[PDB]
Amino acid sequence: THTLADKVVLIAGGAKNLGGLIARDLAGHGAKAVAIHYNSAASQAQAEETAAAVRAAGAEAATFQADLTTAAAVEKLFDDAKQRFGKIDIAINTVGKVLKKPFTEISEAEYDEMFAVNSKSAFFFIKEAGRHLEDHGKLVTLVTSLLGAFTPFYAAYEGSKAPVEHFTRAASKEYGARGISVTAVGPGPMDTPFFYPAEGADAVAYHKTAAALSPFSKTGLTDIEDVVPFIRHLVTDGWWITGQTILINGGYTTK
Amino acid sequence: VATHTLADKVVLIAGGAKNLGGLIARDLAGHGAKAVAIHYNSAASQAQAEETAAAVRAAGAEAATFQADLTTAAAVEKLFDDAKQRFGKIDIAINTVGKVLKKPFTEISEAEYDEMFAVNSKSAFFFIKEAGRHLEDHGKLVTLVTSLLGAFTPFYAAYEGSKAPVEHFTRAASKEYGARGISVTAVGPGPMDTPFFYPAEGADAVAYHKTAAALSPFSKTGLTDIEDVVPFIRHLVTDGWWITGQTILINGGYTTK
Numbered sequence: 001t002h003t004l005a006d007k008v009v010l011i012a013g014g015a016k017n018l019g020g021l022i023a024r025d026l027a028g029h030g031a032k033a034v035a036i037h038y039n040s041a042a043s044q045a046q047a048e049e050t051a052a053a054v055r056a057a058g059a060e061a062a063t064f065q066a067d068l069t070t071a072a073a074v075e076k077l078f079d080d081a082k083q084r085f086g087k088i089d090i091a092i093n094t095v096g097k098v099l100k101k102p103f104t105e106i107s108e109a110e111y112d113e114m115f116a117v118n119s120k121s122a123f124f125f126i127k128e129a130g131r132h133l134e135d136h137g138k139l140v141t142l143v144t145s146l147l148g149a150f151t152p153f154y155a156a157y158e159g160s161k162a163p164v165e166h167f168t169r170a171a172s173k174e175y176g177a178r179g180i181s182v183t184a185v186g187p188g189p190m191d192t193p194f195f196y197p198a199e200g201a202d203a204v205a206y207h208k209t210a211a212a213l214s215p216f217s218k219t220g221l222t223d224i225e226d227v228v229p230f231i232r233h234l235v236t237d238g239w240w241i242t243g244q245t246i247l248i249n250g251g252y253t254t255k
Numbered sequence: 256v257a258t259h260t261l262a263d264k265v266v267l268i269a270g271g272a273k274n275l276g277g278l279i280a281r282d283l284a285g286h287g288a289k290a291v292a293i294h295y296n297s298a299a300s301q302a303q304a305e306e307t308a309a310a311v312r313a314a315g316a317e318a319a320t321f322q323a324d325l326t327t328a329a330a331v332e333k334l335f336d337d338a339k340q341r342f343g344k345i346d347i348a349i350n351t352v353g354k355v356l357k358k359p360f361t362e363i364s365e366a367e368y369d370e371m372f373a374v375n376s377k378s379a380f381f382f383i384k385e386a387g388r389h390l391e392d393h394g395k396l397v398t399l400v401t402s403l404l405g406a407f408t409p410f411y412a413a414y415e416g417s418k419a420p421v422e423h424f425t426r427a428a429s430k431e432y433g434a435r436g437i438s439v440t441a442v443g444p445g446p447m448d449t450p451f452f453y454p455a456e457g458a459d460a461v462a463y464h465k466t467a468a469a470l471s472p473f474s475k476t477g478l479t480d481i482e483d484v485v486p487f488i489r490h491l492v493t494d495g496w497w498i499t500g501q502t503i504l505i506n507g508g509y510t511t512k
């Protein structure tokens with residue numbers, strides 16, 4: 001079946017911003033339960049409000065804290081969510097971190113955290129989804145539209161999201177025998193608290209006018225409410241899309 | 256004003272003692288390079304490093320060897336520092352360091368992931384960073400990747416995935432280093448006839464790779480021969496300087512992009 005009925009969703013980064021809206025959207029469109037992962041203690045209140053909204057929208061909900069930069073923490077998240085809800089059908093990973101800096105200034109500490117958050121956590125999320133998802137399940141990871149760009153300053157960000165496209169290719173081939181669809185989604189720069197800290201005033205002005213459809217979103221950036229319906233499609237009637245990394249950005253970059 | 260030959264140029268090669276890098280070392284020395292700094296990792300590679308150094312000297316260039324495990328930023332920093340202490344400058348920096356792993360996604364351990372990314376991604380990031388800090392104006396920066404970047408295939412998630420960052424490092428560095436005249440490229444051979452290839456591949460896969468390129472009947476084994484990769488690297492670091500910001504596949508017609 002290609003609806004949300006009886007489906008259990010796990011969302012890494014599901015407490016706020018894009019993931020918190022996915023949680024509300026999939027619940028409201030009929031999902032059975034949403035396992036809501038969050039990382040920082042400052043995100044807990046949003047995680048609990050997201051859980052309450054999921055319940056009001058008709059689904060069960062539970063929250064799970066973890067730092068997902070270790071393989072064991074990812075395994076434990078899947079184990080704990082499956083223990084709570086009995087199965088996992090749809091696994092969506094929004095975990096990420098941005099850095100914008102000249103290549104010659106990027107420290108080892110910055111490299112290490114960028115790759116642990118954007119590459120390693122995504123690898124083990126894909127691994128553990130392969131070990132835990134029900135047959136015919138869904139696996140989606142968030143990347144960046146900068147994978148289609150030719151631009152300075154994002155070496156550690158663009159470079160640490162790049163593995164996900166290739167993880168998605170391999171997992172699509174390896175998990176397809178069980179009916180699982182595996183995709184990666186790259187929004188344009190989005191109007192969320194994730195975007196602004198890395199971007200000076202000139203850069204923000206550029207990003208806000210760089211998409212063909214910029215005049216028609218709220219700020220000129222990608223709005224999360226225009227990303228969630230595509231994720232909903234991929235995990236329902238868009239199941240035949242697999243092994244692809246797709247850019248949803250208002251006409252910002254292409255590939 | 257730049258010169259587009261190897262005359263007076265100092266070359267640093269990570270993994271320069273054997274296989275592809277050792278042939279690059281001999282080729283660039285034979286075509287007129289001033290000096291080659293030959294990096295190697297394992298003690299088992301030391302004899303080949305010194306043999307390569309002697310061959311570089313016979314070809315007319317100075318040569319020195321440098322052992323290092325390049326999975327930490329400090330070791331990459333020190334490699335460039337030591338090469339500069341010996342030769343005074345670095346003009347051409349070529350990184351061949353890598354590691355292959357082929358296995359199902361659900362079988363890859365944390366230790367295997369960690370080493371694959373340290374060797375294929377982290378070492379390459381810091382090589383590109385330190386080349387940005389050390390290369391002479393008009394210099395050259397080349398990193399080896401894999402033609403699997405153009406493939407849609409199972410079992411290489413940790414290998415294809417850990418070489419993928421290099422394509423994007425190469426884009427950013429091309430843009431940032433171009434102001435100093437530096438050209439930055441990545442080169443992805445097909446599966447090559449070297450000891451790196453065989454241990455990870457089952458016999459069935461070896462036979463497939465040997466027939467998978469349009470020009471397979473015309474190489475020595477059907478795989479990519481290192482002798483057909485080195486002239487392209489020589490081109491990129493000489494008269495092909497206008498190629499920058501690109502990841503190019505050299506594979507006999509195996510994958511495309």
Ligand SMILES: NC(=O)c1ccc[n+]([C@@H]2O[C@H](COP(=O)([O-])OP(=O)(O)OC[C@H]3O[C@@H](n4cnc5c(N)ncnc54)[C@H](OP(=O)(O)O)[C@@H]3O)[C@@H](O)[C@H]2O)c1
Nearest residue numbers: 013017018039040043067068094095096189190192194195
């Ligand atoms: N916003 C944009 O401009 C933009 C553009 C293109 C793509 N994207 C991608 O879209 C995704 C969602 O972005 P968003 O705008 O919704 O912002 P966001 O809420 O800040 O998304 C990042 C998420 O990653 C989590 N995270 C960071 N370090 C972690 C760790 N060690 N372990 C586990 N989780 C960790 C964050 O948790 P805490 O905050 O609680 O630490 C947060 O939940 C990200 O992957 C981002 O790269 C964003």
Ligand SMILES: NC(=O)c1ccc[n+]([C@@H]2O[C@H](COP(=O)([O-])OP(=O)(O)OC[C@H]3O[C@@H](n4cnc5c(N)ncnc54)[C@H](OP(=O)(O)O)[C@@H]3O)[C@@H](O)[C@H]2O)c1
Nearest residue numbers: 270274275296297300324325351352353446447449451452
């Ligand atoms: N051979 C192929 O089938 C193939 C195909 C496509 C692309 N490539 C790429 O081409 C490049 C050269 O391959 P090759 O065939 O010439 O084989 P190779 O000689 O085995 O090249 C790999 C090099 O990486 C070094 N290395 C490994 N771990 C290291 C570490 N921790 N620190 C520093 N150096 C380290 C190895 O040194 P030690 O051996 O001394 O440890 C060796 O010098 C690699 O990047 C590979 O990924 C190869």
